[PDB]
Amino acid sequence: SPSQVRQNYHQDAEAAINRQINLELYASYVYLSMSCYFDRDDVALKNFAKYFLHQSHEEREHAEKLMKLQNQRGGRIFLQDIKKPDRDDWESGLNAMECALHLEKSVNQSLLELHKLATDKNDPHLCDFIETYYLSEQVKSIKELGDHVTNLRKMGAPEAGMAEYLFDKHTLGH
Amino acid sequence: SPSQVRQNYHQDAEAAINRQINLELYASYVYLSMSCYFDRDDVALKNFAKYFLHQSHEEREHAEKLMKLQNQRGGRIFLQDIKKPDRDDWESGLNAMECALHLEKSVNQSLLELHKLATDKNDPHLCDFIETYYLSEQVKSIKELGDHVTNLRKMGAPEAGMAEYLFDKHTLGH
Amino acid sequence: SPSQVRQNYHQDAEAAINRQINLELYASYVYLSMSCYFDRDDVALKNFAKYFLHQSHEEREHAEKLMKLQNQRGGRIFLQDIKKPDRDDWESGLNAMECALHLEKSVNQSLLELHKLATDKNDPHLCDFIETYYLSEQVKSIKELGDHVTNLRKMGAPEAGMAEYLFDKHTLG
Amino acid sequence: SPSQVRQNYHQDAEAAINRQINLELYASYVYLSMSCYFDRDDVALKNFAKYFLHQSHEEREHAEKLMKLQNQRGGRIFLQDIKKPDRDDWESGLNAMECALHLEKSVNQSLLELHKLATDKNDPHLCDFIETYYLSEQVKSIKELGDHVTNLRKMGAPEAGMAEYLFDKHTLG
Amino acid sequence: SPSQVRQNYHQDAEAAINRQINLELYASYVYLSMSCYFDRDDVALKNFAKYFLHQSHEEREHAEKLMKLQNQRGGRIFLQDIKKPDRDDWESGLNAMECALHLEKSVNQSLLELHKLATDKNDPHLCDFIETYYLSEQVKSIKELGDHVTNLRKMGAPEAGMAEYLFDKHTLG
Amino acid sequence: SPSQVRQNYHQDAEAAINRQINLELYASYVYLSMSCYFDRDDVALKNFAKYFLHQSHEEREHAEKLMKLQNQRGGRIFLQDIKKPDRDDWESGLNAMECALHLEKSVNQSLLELHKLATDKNDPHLCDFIETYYLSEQVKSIKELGDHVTNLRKMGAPEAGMAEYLFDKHTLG
Ligand SMILES: [Fe+3]
Ligand SMILES: [Mg+2]
Ligand SMILES: [Mg+2]
Ligand SMILES: [Mg+2]
Ligand SMILES: [Mg+2]
Ligand SMILES: [Mg+2]
Ligand SMILES: [Mg+2]
Ligand SMILES: [Mg+2]
Ligand SMILES: [Mg+2]
Ligand SMILES: [Mg+2]
Ligand SMILES: [Mg+2]
C-alpha cells in the first residue's frame, strides 16, 4: 500500500500538510480579493492592489511547494474546496492591512501546529522543511504588515484622506 | 448607486463575468490537481507535470484579467468558493489530456454563452474583449489538446508503457 | 459618386463618421482649454497642464484616424466648425477631471451609437475598426479619469490645498 | 461523427470556408498570371511584375491561413480545381490594376457574405478571425489599388507612353 | 484686478493674442482639410497629403506657443469657435498650393498688424517674441509655397497629368 | 509576330514548357493537400505537415522559374486549370510519402520527355536549364522520399503506432 519512497512520514503529518495546502490557497484567494478591491475605480490605490496581488502569488507558491513536499515524502495530495473570503468590501487601506496581519498570524498558528505535530512524530526532515521555507518568511511578513498598520494609523488613516494616498506612493510605490 | 465609470454595462453581463471568473479559477485548480498527479513518484512524468502547472498559471491569468475588466467597466467583483476537482487520481497521461480537452470545451461553452449575452445587450466592448483575449486562445488550446490526445492514442497509451514516457520527452519537453 | 473603392458602406455610416470626426476634434479643443487653464500663473499645476495637453493631442490623432477611415471606405469628409468649450475657467484640478470624465463618456456614448449604426447596416469592417481603435481606448480612459477623480476627492480636493499639488507630483509626475 | 475539437462550428461555415479557400487560391493565380505578363520582353515593367508576384504570394498565405482555421475548428478541407484566369493578355499596367481592383472587390464581397454567414450562426470566433485577418486587409488593398488606378489615369496611361514606365519606377519601385 | 505677473502687457495686445490664436487654429484646420483631400482614392497624392498634414501640426504648435505667451504675460485665454474652411474640395495640388499661399499671407498680415500694435504700446518683449518665432517663419513659408506654385505652373499643372504626380515624388518626397 | 528575343526556340518546346508549368503547380497543390491532412487534429503530425508545406512552396518556385524561362526565350505563357488532387484523405504518414514518391517520379518522367524534346530540336540552352535546375533536384528528392518510405516501413508504419510519431520527431524534426 505505502509509496516506495515513503519513510518516517506519519499519516497525521500527511493529513496536516493537505490541510496546510488548503490554507495557503485560501490565503492566496484572500489576497486576490483585497487586490481587486483596491483596483476599483472608487478605491483606486494601484500600489495597494499590486502589493496584494504579489502577496496572492506568493501564497500560491507556498501551496505548490507544500504539494511538492507531499509528493517527495510519498504522501498523497487531497484537494478541498477553497472557500471564498469572509467579505468582498475591504473598507480601506488600513483595514485591508489589519486583516492581512490577522490572516498571516492565523497561517503562522497553523504552521507552528504543524511543526509541533512533526516534532511529536520525530520527523526532522519535515521540521527542517517547515523551518527553512515557511517560518522565517511568516515572521518577516507579520513584522512587515505590523509596520504597515502602524504607519497608516499614525498617519490618520482612513479618515485623513491624504494618508492612504501618500502611503500608496511612498511605502508601496516603493 | 452605479459606478461613476459605468456605461452600457448590463447587470447580467456583470453577473456573468463573476461566474466566468469562478470558472477560470476552477480550471486553474483542475490543472494544478493534474500537475500534482504527474509529480507523484508512482507516476513520475515530469513534463506532463510542468505542462499542466503552466496551464494552471495561465487560467489564473484568465481569471485576473476578467477581474480587471470587471473593475474597468464599473461592475463589482463577487467571489465564490472554488470547488475542488471531481477526483484526485487522473489515471494516465492520456486520460488527463482527454479531461483537459473536455474542460477547455466546457470553458469555451461558457465564454460563447457570455458573448451571446454581450451581443444581445449590445455591448460591443465586452464582445471585443472576449474575442481578443479569450476565444482564439480557447480554439488554440482545444486544438492542441486534441492533437495531444490523438498522438497518445495512436502511440498505444496507456497500455503501451513507452508511449507516455516518450510523449513526455518529445512533445512536452520542447 | 460612388467612389471606385466604395463597398458596403452606407451613407448613414458616412454621415455618422463625419459627426464623430467633429466630436473628436471638439474633445481635442476642450482638453486644450484645460491645459491652458492649468498653465495659468494663478493655477500653476504643470503636470495637470501636460496631462491635458497630451490628451488633446491624442484626440486630434483619433480625429485624423477617422478621417483616414472615411477616405479608405470611399466616403467623403465634410468638416464643420469646431465649437468652443462651454467655459473658460475650469476652477480646479478635481473639477477639470470630472468634466474630462463626463467628456469621455459623452464621446464613448457617441461611439457606441456609431457602432450600433454600423451593426444595423451590417458593416462588419466599420464595427471592427471602432472596437479595435476606439472602444477599448475609451473604456481605459474612463477608468483612469474615474480613478483620478476618486483620489482627488479622497484627498480633500479642492479645499485641502495640498491635495492637487501632491497629486500633480505623485500621480501626474 | 464530428471531430473531437469541433465546437460551435456549423456545417455551412465549414463549406463556406472551403469555397473561400478556393477563391483565395484563384486570386493568387490571377495575380501570378499578371506578374507573368509584365515580365514579357514586350511589356517589360519589372516592378509591375514584382508587385503582382508579391500579391500572388500574399493571396496564397490567405488561402493557407483559412486551411489552418478549418483544421483548428475541426472542419475538413475539400480542395477543388483552381480555375485559370479569364485571359492571358492583361493589356497594360492600368488595365491590370483595374482588373485587380475588381478582383479584390469580388473577394471582399465573398468575405462579407462569409461574415454574414458566421454572424447568422452565432460564431463569434469565426467572425473575429475574418475581421482580424481578412476584412481590414481587404479594405487596405482596395484603397491601394484605387489610388494606383487613379494615378495611372491622371498620368495618361496607357496612351502616354512615359506613364507606366515612370509609375513603375516611382510608385512601384 | 490683474495677474501678479502682468507688467507692460496691454489689454489690446491680450485681445489681439486671442485672435491670433484662433487664426493659427483655423489655419491648422485648413491644412488638415487639404491633407484629407489628397488622401482621397480619386486624388491619391500621398506626399501632398503628408506635406499639408505636417503644415497642419506646425500651425497648431503656433497656436500653442501663443497660448503659452499669453499665460507667461498674465493674459487670459478666451477660445472661440474654429470655423470650417471655406470649401471641402481643393481641386488640385496647384490650387491647394495657391490657396495655401493666400492663407499664409493673410496670417502674415495679421502678425504684422499684431506687431504694429505691440510697437504702438511699447511692448518690446511681444515684438521680439513675434519676430523670433513667427515673422521669419512666415516669410520662409511664403517663399516656399510661391516656389511650389511656380514649379507646378511651369510643369503644366493640373492639365498636364504627369505634373502633380512627379512633383509629389520629387519635390514633396 | 515572333518575339524580338526569340531564337532557336521551337513551338513544341514552348507548348511543352506550358504543360510542365501546369504540372509543377499541380505538384504544389498535391503537397499542400498533404500538409493540410497532417495538420488535422485526428492526424496531428506537425513535422509531416511542415515538411509537405515546404515541398509545396518549392514546387511553386519550380513553376515560377519555368514561367521566367518561357518569357526569357520569347515564348508565351498560357495557364490552365490546376486540377485538384485525386483525394482528400492521405491515410497515413507512410502512404503520403509513397504518393509523394510516385508524384516526384511522374514529374521527373515529364521533365525527361521535355529534355528529350529539347534535345530533338537542338535547343542546348533549354537542355542546360533543365539539367541545371530540375533534373538533379528531382533525383535528390526521389532518393530522399525513397529513404523516408524505407524507414517508415522498416519501422512498422502505420500499424505500429509509435512509428510515425517517432519519425516525425527524429527525421522530420
Ligand atoms: Fe509627499
Ligand atoms: Mg503562506
Ligand atoms: Mg529542530
Ligand atoms: Mg481559461
Ligand atoms: Mg462583433
Ligand atoms: Mg477619443
Ligand atoms: Mg485574400
Ligand atoms: Mg474583432
Ligand atoms: Mg502659423
Ligand atoms: Mg529682436
Ligand atoms: Mg518540381
How many domains is chain D built from?
Answer: 1
Asked if D142 contacts D51 with a C-beta cutoff of 8 angstroms, the reply is no
Question: Rounded to an integer, what distance in angstroms lies between the CA atom of residue B3 and that of residue A41?
Answer: 8
Residue B68 to residues A6, C61, F103: CA-CA distances in angstroms? Answer: 44, 27, 56
Ligand nearest to the CA of C135: 6
Nearest chain D Cα to E46, which residue? D147
Residue C53 to residues A58, B45, C165, E78, E108: CA-CA distances in angstroms? Answer: 40, 58, 18, 17, 26
Phi-psi region of D76 (alpha: psi -120 to 50; beta: other; left: phi over 0): beta
Asked if C164 contacts C93 with a C-beta cutoff of 8 angstroms, the reply is yes
CB atoms within 10 A of CB D66: 26
Three-class secondary structure of residue E82 per DSSP: strand
Q: What is the 3-state secondary structure (H, E, C) of E89-155?
A: CCCCHHHHHHHHHHHHHHHHHHHHHHHHHHHHCCCHHHHHHHHHHHHHHHHHHHHHHHHHHHHHHHH
Ligand nearest to the CA of D61: 7
Which residue from E4, E45, E32 is spatially nearest to E100, judged by alpha carbons?
Answer: E32
Q: Is E130 exposed, middle or buried (0-12, 13-18, 19+ CB in 10 A)?
A: buried
Asked if the C-beta of C65 comes within 8 angstroms of chain E's C-beta atoms, the answer is: no
Look up residue B115 and give its three cell numbers: 458573448
Question: Rounded to an integer, what distance in angstroms lies between the CA atom of residue F117 and that of residue F17?
Answer: 10
To the nearest whole Å, the CA of B41 is away from the closest chain D CA by: 32
- C24 labeled part of a ligand binding site: yes
Asked if B79 contacts A89 with a C-beta cutoff of 8 angstroms, the reply is no
* E131 CA → ligand 10 middle, Å: 6
Asked if the C-beta of D4 comes within 8 angstroms of chain B's C-beta atoms, the answer is: yes
Which residue from C80, C156, C142, C79 is spatially nearest to C112, judged by alpha carbons?
Answer: C142
Chains A and D touch (3+ CB pairs under 8 A): no
A1 CB contacts (<8 Å, ≥6 apart)? none
DSSP codes joined into one string, B130-161: HIIIIIHHHHHHHHHHHHHHHHHHHTTTTTSH
Question: Rounded to an integer, what distance in angstroms lies between the CA atom of residue D130 and that of residue D137?
Answer: 10
In the block, residue with C-alpha cell 475539437 = D5
Asked if the C-beta of B33 comes within 8 angstroms of chain A's C-beta atoms, the answer is: yes
* D24 CA → ligand 7 middle, Å: 5
Nearest chain B Cα to A36, which residue? B67
Interface test with C, best of A36, A38, A42, A48 (most C CBs within 10 A): A42
- A98 labeled part of a ligand binding site: no
Write phi, then psi, for F82 (nearest 5 degrees): -90, 110
Question: Rounded to an integer, what distance in angstroms lies between the CA atom of residue C35 and that of residue E64?
Answer: 10
Q: Which residues of C8-41 are buried (b: 16+ CB within 10 A; e: fewer)?
A: bbbeebbebbbebbbbbbbbbbbbbbbbbbbbbe
Does A84 contact B83 at a Cβ distance shorter than 8 Å? no
Does A88 contact B78 at a Cβ distance shorter than 8 Å? yes
Question: Rounded to an integer, what distance in angstroms lies between the CA atom of residue E77 and that of residue E21?
Answer: 9
Write phi, then psi, for D82 (nearest 5 degrees): -90, 115
Interface test with F, best of B145, B154, B167 (most F CBs within 10 A): B154
Three-class secondary structure of residue A82 per DSSP: strand
Q: Which residues of A109-122 are buried (b: 16+ CB within 10 A; e: fewer)?
A: ebbeebbebbeebe
Interface test with D, best of B94, B107, B113, B115 (most D CBs within 10 A): B115
Q: Point out which residues pair with E82 in neighbouring strands.
A: C82
Asked if A114 contacts A20 with a C-beta cutoff of 8 angstroms, the reply is yes
Asked if B83 contacts B26 with a C-beta cutoff of 8 angstroms, the reply is yes
Angle among Cα C106, C107, C108 to the nearest 5 degrees reads 90
In the block, residue with C-alpha cell 492533437 = B147
Nearest chain D Cα to E173, which residue? D170
Does E83 contact C81 at a Cβ distance shorter than 8 Å? yes
CATH, residue C97 = 1.20.1260.10
Domain encompassing residue F143: 1-173
Q: List for chain F the helix, strand, coil content (%; round to 5).
A: 70, 0, 30
Question: Rounded to an integer, what distance in angstroms lies between the CA atom of residue B66 and that of residue B60?
Answer: 10
Resolution of the structure in the document, Å: 2.2
Question: Rounded to an integer, what distance in angstroms lies between the CA atom of residue C127 and that of residue C12?
Answer: 14
* B30 CA → ligand 8 middle, Å: 30
Question: Rounded to an integer, what distance in angstroms lies between the CA atom of residue B122 and that of residue B127?
Answer: 9
Write phi, then psi, for C82 (nearest 5 degrees): -90, 115
Experimental determination approach used: X-ray
F155 CB contacts (<8 Å, ≥6 apart)? F163, F166, F167
Asked if E38 contacts D151 with a C-beta cutoff of 8 angstroms, the reply is no
Three-class secondary structure of residue C41 per DSSP: coil
E71 CB contacts (<8 Å, ≥6 apart)? C36, C39, C40, C41, E77
Asked if the C-beta of E71 comes within 8 angstroms of chain C's C-beta atoms, the answer is: yes
Which residue from B17, B10, B7 is spatially nearest to B114, judged by alpha carbons?
Answer: B17
Look up residue A166 and give its three cell numbers: 501618500
Question: What number of CA atoms fall less than 13 Å from residue C77's CA on the CB side?
Answer: 33
Look up residue C171 and give its three cell numbers: 500621480
Asked if E19 contacts E77 with a C-beta cutoff of 8 angstroms, the reply is no
Q: How big is the B-F interface in CB pairs under 8 Å?
A: 35
Which chains, if any, share at least 3 CB pairs under 8 A with chain C?
A: A, B, D, E
Which residue from D172, D33, D153 is spatially nearest to D95, judged by alpha carbons?
Answer: D153
Look up residue E14 and give its three cell numbers: 491680450
Nearest chain B Cα to D73, which residue? B139
Q: Which residues of B are annotated as a binding site?
A: 24, 59, 62, 104, 138
To the nearest whole Å, the CA of B104 is away from the closest chain A CA by: 20
Question: Rounded to an integer, what distance in angstroms lies between the CA atom of residue D55 and that of residue D148?
Answer: 14
Q: Point out which residues pair with B82 in neighbouring strands.
A: A82
B chain contacts of residue D74, beta-carbon cutoff 8 Å: 146
CB atoms within 10 A of CB F166: 17
Question: Rounded to an integer, what distance in angstroms lies between the CA atom of residue E8 and that of residue E128?
Answer: 14
Asked if A70 contacts A18 with a C-beta cutoff of 8 angstroms, the reply is yes
Q: Is B2 exposed, middle or buried (0-12, 13-18, 19+ CB in 10 A)?
A: exposed
* A140 CA → ligand 1 middle, Å: 27
Question: Rounded to an integer, what distance in angstroms lies between the CA atom of residue D130 and that of residue C124?
Answer: 9
Nearest chain C Cα to A92, which residue? C154
A chain contacts of residue B32, beta-carbon cutoff 8 Å: 64, 67, 79
In the block, residue with C-alpha cell 514518391 = F101
Alpha helices per DSSP H over F39-92: 46-73
In the stretch 137-166 of chain D, residues with CB closer than 8 A to chain E read: 143, 146-148, 150-151, 153-156, 160, 162-163, 166
Question: Rounded to an integer, what distance in angstroms lies between the CA atom of residue B149 and that of residue B151?
Answer: 6
Question: Rounded to an integer, what distance in angstroms lies between the CA atom of residue D143 and that of residue C7?
Answer: 11
Q: Which residues in chain D are immediately followed by a break of C to N over 2.5 Å?
A: none
Q: Which residues of D are annotated as a binding site?
A: 24, 59, 62, 104, 138
Look up residue C137 and give its three cell numbers: 481606448
A32 CB contacts (<8 Å, ≥6 apart)? A52, A53, A56, B64, B67, B79
Does D71 contact F5 at a Cβ distance shorter than 8 Å? no
Residue E162 is classified by DSSP as: H
Question: Rounded to an integer, what distance in angstroms lies between the CA atom of residue B145 and that of residue B96?
Answer: 10
In the block, residue with C-alpha cell 514606365 = D165
B132 CB contacts (<8 Å, ≥6 apart)? D128
Helix D162-170 and helix E162-170: axis angle, to 10°? Answer: 20
In the block, residue with C-alpha cell 515529364 = F110
- The helix (H) or strand (E) run that includes residue E24 is helix E11-38
Question: Rounded to an integer, what distance in angstroms lies between the CA atom of residue E83 and that of residue F143?
Answer: 77
Interface test with F, best of B140, B151, B162, B172 (most F CBs within 10 A): B151
Closest CB to B146: pick one of F41, F161, F165.
Answer: F41
Three-class secondary structure of residue F3 per DSSP: coil
Look up residue E98 and give its three cell numbers: 495657391
Nearest chain F Cα to D61, which residue? F57
Asked if A102 contacts A110 with a C-beta cutoff of 8 angstroms, the reply is no
Write phi, then psi, for B71 (nearest 5 degrees): -60, -40
C15 CB contacts (<8 Å, ≥6 apart)? none
Does D74 contact B127 at a Cβ distance shorter than 8 Å? no
Which residue from E132, E135, E143, E144 is spatially nearest to E172, judged by alpha carbons?
Answer: E144
* C162 CA → ligand 1 middle, Å: 10
Three-class secondary structure of residue D90 per DSSP: coil
* E119 CA → ligand 10 middle, Å: 12
Angle among Cα D153, D156, D161 to the nearest 5 degrees reads 130
Which residue from A23, A27, A51, A25 is spatially nearest to A37, judged by alpha carbons?
Answer: A51
Asked if E53 contacts E31 with a C-beta cutoff of 8 angstroms, the reply is yes
Residue C7 is classified by DSSP as: -
Asked if F118 contacts F73 with a C-beta cutoff of 8 angstroms, the reply is no
Residue B87 to residues A17, B40, B47, E60: CA-CA distances in angstroms? Answer: 18, 15, 21, 67
Look up residue D143 and give its three cell numbers: 484603397
- State how far Cα B80 lies from the chain centre: 17
Question: Rounded to an integer, what distance in angstroms lies between the CA atom of residue F97 and that of residue E101?
Answer: 72
Look up residue F70 and give its three cell numbers: 518561357
Residue D86 is classified by DSSP as: S
Look up residue A118 and give its three cell numbers: 512533526
* C102 CA → ligand 1 middle, Å: 29
Asked if the C-beta of D71 comes within 8 angstroms of chain B's C-beta atoms, the answer is: yes
- The helix (H) or strand (E) run that includes residue C82 is none
* D128 CA → ligand 7 middle, Å: 16
Chains D and B touch (3+ CB pairs under 8 A): yes
Cα-only R_g, chain F: 18
Three-class secondary structure of residue C160 per DSSP: coil
Q: Point out which residues pair with C82 in neighbouring strands.
A: E82
Asked if E88 contacts C77 with a C-beta cutoff of 8 angstroms, the reply is yes
In the block, residue with C-alpha cell 515572333 = F2
Question: Rounded to an integer, what distance in angstroms lies between the CA atom of residue B165 and that of residue B161?
Answer: 7
Q: Is E159 exposed, middle or buried (0-12, 13-18, 19+ CB in 10 A)?
A: exposed
* C14 CA → ligand 7 middle, Å: 26
In the block, residue with C-alpha cell 499542400 = F32
Ligand nearest to the CA of A123: 3
Length of chain E measured in residues: 173
In the block, residue with C-alpha cell 505667451 = E69
- The helix (H) or strand (E) run that includes residue E84 is none
E27 CB contacts (<8 Å, ≥6 apart)? E59, E103, E104, E107
Nearest chain C Cα to A167, which residue? C170
DSSP codes joined into one string, B2-59: --TT--S--HHHHHHHHHHHHHHHHHHHHHHHHHHHHTSTTT--HHHHHHHHHHHHHH
